[PDB]
């Protein structure tokens, strides 16, 4: 599923991401924009052999099981395929664990490089929230 910007903002809000660990909704929508371009089906192989999955490009080295990442953990206790669903519940639940891991949203390199310090409120501007 390719979400609309405000459609994704509404779904992230319903699932409790709006100001989760102090990160406003625009931060989450900005991260999704540059990670996946709002595509739930996005996958990307990393140099280390891990893969990133879904709207927030969650990595198989720590967070989900894909059966092909040697030495990895599954700290969200989910198949990585669950992160590609049109229903973002699994991605949101796993993102809450990741953002709580100690470095906040710096866990998402694209958030640090393209969202951090920017006018992230622009990502929810015009949305009925
Ligand atoms: Cl933080
Ligand atoms: Na894994």
From Swiss-Prot:
Record family assignment: Belongs to the glycosyl hydrolase 22 family.
MF annotations from Gene Ontology: beta-N-acetylglucosaminidase activity; identical protein binding; lysozyme activity
EC number(s) reported in the record: 3.2.1.17
Compartments where located: Secreted
Name of the featured protein: Lysozyme C
Subunit record text: Monomer.
Organism encoding this protein: Gallus gallus
Keywords noted in UniProt: Allergen, Antimicrobial, Bacteriolytic enzyme, Disulfide bond, Glycosidase, Hydrolase, Secreted, Signal
Role: Lysozymes have primarily a bacteriolytic function; those in tissues and body fluids are associated with the monocyte-macrophage system and enhance the activity of immunoagents. Has bacteriolytic activity against M.luteus.
Keyword Transmembrane included in the entry's annotation: no
SMART domains: LYZ1
Catalytic activities: Hydrolysis of (1->4)-beta-linkages between N-acetylmuramic acid and N-acetyl-D-glucosamine residues in a peptidoglycan and between N-acetyl-D-glucosamine residues in chitodextrins
Entry comment describing in which tissues the protein is expressed: In the egg white and polymorphonuclear leukocytes.
């Amino acid at each position: 599923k390719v979400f609309g910007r405000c459609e994704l903002a509404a779904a992230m809000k319903r699932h409790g991401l709006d100001n989760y660990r102090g990160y406003s909704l625009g931060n989450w929508v900005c991260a999704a924009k540059f990670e996946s371009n709002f595509n739930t089906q996005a996958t990307n192989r990393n140099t280390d052999g891990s893969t990133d999955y879904g709207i927030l490009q969650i990595n198989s080295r720590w967070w989900c099981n894909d059966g092909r990442t040697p030495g990895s953990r599954n700290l969200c206790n989910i198949p990585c395929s669950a992160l590609l669903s049109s229903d973002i519940t699994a991605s949101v639940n796993c993102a809450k664990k990741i953002v709580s891991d100690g470095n906040g949203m710096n866990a998402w390199v694209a958030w640090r490089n393209r969202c951090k310090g920017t006018d992230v409120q622009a990502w929810i501007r015009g949305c009925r929230l």
